[PDB]
Structure formats: C-alpha cells, structure tokens
Amino acid sequence: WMPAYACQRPTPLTHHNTGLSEALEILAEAAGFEGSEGRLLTFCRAASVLKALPSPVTTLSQLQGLPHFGEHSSRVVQELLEHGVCEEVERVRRSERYQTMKLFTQIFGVGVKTADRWYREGLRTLDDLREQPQKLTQQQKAGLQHHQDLSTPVLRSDVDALQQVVEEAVGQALPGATVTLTGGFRRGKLQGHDVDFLITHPKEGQEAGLLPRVMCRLQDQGLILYHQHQHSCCAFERSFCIFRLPQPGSWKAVRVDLVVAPVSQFPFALLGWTGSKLFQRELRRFSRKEKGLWLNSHGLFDPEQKTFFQAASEEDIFRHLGLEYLPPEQRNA
Numbered sequence: 001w002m003p004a005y006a007c008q009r010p011t012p013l014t015h016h017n018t019g020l021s022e023a024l025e026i027l028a029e030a031a032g033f034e035g036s037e038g039r040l041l042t043f044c045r046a047a048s049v050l051k052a053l054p055s056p057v058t059t060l061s062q063l064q065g066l067p068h069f070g071e072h073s074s075r076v077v078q079e080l081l082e083h084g085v086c087e088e089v090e091r092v093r094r095s096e097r098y099q100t101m102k103l104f105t106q107i108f109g110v111g112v113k114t115a116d117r118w119y120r121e122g123l124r125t126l127d128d129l130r131e132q133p134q135k136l137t138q139q140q141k142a143g144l145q146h147h148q149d150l151s152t153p154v155l156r157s158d159v160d161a162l163q164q165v166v167e168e169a170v171g172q173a174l175p176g177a178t179v180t181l182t183g184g185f186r187r188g189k190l191q192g193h194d195v196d197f198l199i200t201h202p203k204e205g206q207e208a209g210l211l212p213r214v215m216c217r218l219q220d221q222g223l224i225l226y227h228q229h230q231h232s233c234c235a236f237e238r239s240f241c242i243f244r245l246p247q248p249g250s251w252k253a254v255r256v257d258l259v260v261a262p263v264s265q266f267p268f269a270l271l272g273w274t275g276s277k278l279f280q281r282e283l284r285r286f287s288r289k290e291k292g293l294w295l296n297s298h299g300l301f302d303p304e305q306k307t308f309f310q311a312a313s314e315e316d317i318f319r320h321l322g323l324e325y326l327p328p329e330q331r332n333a
C-alpha cells in the first residue's frame with residue numbers, strides 16, 4: 001500500500017515512469033488551460049503516484065489497488081503500454097488551442113486567464129503579441145523581449161553564479177542577512193524555469209528595507225534587466241526579476257524571484273516556497289481535512305482556537321501535523 005496524500009510518501013527527483021507521468025501531465029495541463037480544475041488535480045495526482053513507484057509500470061496489472069487512478073488515467077497508461085502512443089494525448093499535443101495556451105502561459109507574467117483571453121481574441125503567435133503592445137503589461141513586455149533566454153532551461157551552474165551575486169549584494173547591504181535557495185533547485189532538480197531565493201535576518205525587523213538596497217546594488221552592477229518590486233499587502237515583500245547573467249563571451253536572461261520573510265515566518269515561507277506545487281497543495285489539504293489546521297506560507301492557524309503555531313524549522317511543522325519529515329529532495333510530487 002502507498003498513502004493517499006503526496007505529503008505522506010517520499011517522491012524522489014528521478015523515477016521509473018517518466019513517459020507515463022509526462023503523458024498524464026500533458027492531460028493535466030490541458031485541463032488547466034480549459035479551467036477544468038478538477039480534472040487537472042486528478043491527472044496530477046495520478047502522475048504523482050507513478051513518480052513514487054519503486055519500479056516501472058510494464059503491465060496494466062501493476063495499476064491494481066493504486067490510489068488516485070480512475071478509469072481515464074488507467075486508459076491512458078493502457079494505450080501507452082499496448083500501442084506506444086495514446087490518441088488523446090497526441091491530439092492535445094497537436095491542437096492549436098493547447099500549443100497556443102502553452103506558448104502564452106510560458107511567457108513571464110502571463111497566467112491562464114490572460115492567455116485564454118488572448119486566444120479568444122484571435123492572438124496566436126509571439127509576433128501577434130508584439131503587434132499589440134497596448135495589450136501587454138510591462139512585465140509581459142520584458143517576458144517577450146527575453147523569451148528565447150527565458151525558455152532555455154536554467155542550469156545548476158547558473159543558480160550557483162546567481163546565488164553568489166545575490167549573497168554578495170545581501171551581505172554588503174546588511175551583515176547577518178541570509179539568502180536561502182528554495183524552489184525546484186532546493187528539491188534537487190538539475191534545471192528549472194527560474195531561481196527562487198528566500199531572504200531573511202535573525203533579528204526580526206532588520207530585514208525592513210533590505211530588498212530595495214539589494215536591488216540597487218545588483219542594478220548598479222549591470223545584473224538586472226527587469227525588476228518589479230511589490231510591498232507586502234496583508235503578502236511577502238518580493239521582487240520579480242530578470243537577471244542578465246554573464247557567461248563566457250555572451251550572457252543570458254534568467255528569471256529570479258527574491259522573497260523577503262521575517263525570521264518568525266521563515267520556516268513557513270521556506271516550506272511553501274520549496275514546493276513542489278502539488279506537494280504543497282496536498283500538504284495544505286492534509287492539514288485542513290485531516291488536522292483542522294490552515295497551512296500557508298506565513299503560518300499554521302487553528303481556526304477554532306484562533307491560535308498560530310510557533311515553528312523553528314520545517315521539521316517542527318511536519319511534527320505538528322503528525323507527518324514524518326520529508327527532506328526537500330523527496331517533495332518532488
């Protein structure tokens with residue numbers, strides 16, 4: 001038996017069922033593009049199960065008694081096992097709707113609602129968007145300007161170089177302030193679509209006004225192509241950036257999220273920002289459904305008692321929810 005929730009089972013970075021999970025995730029994504037949130041979560045859960053399996057699925061009899069594997073997800077695997085291809089997945093891959101929604105939603109600053117609006121308005125290509133700049137936010141304009149670089153996977157070596165410049169800027173602005181790599185790279189991934197950093201200081205409140213100082217420094221070194229600062233509204237102070245990463249003989253644009261959290265909230269922010277998206281969705285559903293507690297990136301609240309949990313680490317949070325600790329590299333759900 002394998003547990004129902006992704007937060008109750010280790011999901012490693014690499015697994016034995018990449019072809020099958022990829023097919024299911026194409027169906028998940030396409031459902032999300034159509035606003036079919038239910039079907040999205042269903043395919044995503046089924047994909048996540050395959051990722052946690054210790055062996056490859058070579059016959060359909062191996063699906064027996066697995067959670068989150070309904071009729072539709074089973075048929076997909078079946079056709080792939082029996083014919084090497086699933087017709088519905090290939091139709092989706094070649095569909096103009098899917099290809100366009102993928103193209104648009106991949107652009108920095110574009111979500112599903114925007115992509116779908118643009119689709120319904122007859123926009124199809126990147127050039128179509130560039131011909132209608134009045135329809136674009138400044139963030140989306142920057143996304144388009146750098147789209148080739150921003151669709152090139154970010155590598156671990158890029159992350160290392162970026163963490164150095166961010167640590168130097170942070171260290172110069174405020175001694176004692178820390179930078180923590182989060183997101184997919186903290187989960188052990190070898191590549192990504194951006195780099196995520198969480199910034200704090202051990203004395204609560206010393207992190208006030210730090211991010212703008214970090215950004216000034218980075219800007220002065222020629223490292224920033226685009227920067228949008230947002231103050232917290234509640235909800236963390238953050239900066240959405242495109243860095244200009246020097247490389248031997250050239251350079252590349254890379255997406256970076258810099259998030260500041262007060263150290264009291266840091267374990268929650270780290271947990272939330274480390275992901276995966278599905279893992280965190282599942283952890284929050286678990287906390288609510290199973291334990292009656294509301295988890296987010298700022299805290300763990302008991303709505304009956306009107307209390308907040310005091311957490312020193314991620315381990316404290318897992319412990320409090322009755323879950324065995326999962327290090328970041330087993331959260332790849």
Ligand SMILES: Nc1nc2c(ncn2[C@H]2C[C@H](O)[C@@H](COP(=O)(O)OP(=O)(O)OP(=O)(O)O)O2)c(=O)[nH]1
Pocket residue numbers: 182183184185189191192193194195196272273274275276277280297
């Ligand atoms: N607190 C908070 N967490 C978020 C938000 N958006 C996404 N997350 C979570 C879920 C993700 O696993 C994680 C970082 O987002 P990313 O889109 O960078 O995902 P991740 O780094 O896992 O994958 P990647 O390798 O960048 O494609 O943070 C947000 O607005 N607020």
Ligand SMILES: [Mn+2]
Pocket residue numbers: 183184192193194195196
């Ligand atoms: Mn990321």
Ligand SMILES: [Mn+2]
Pocket residue numbers: 183194195196257
């Ligand atoms: Mn990010």
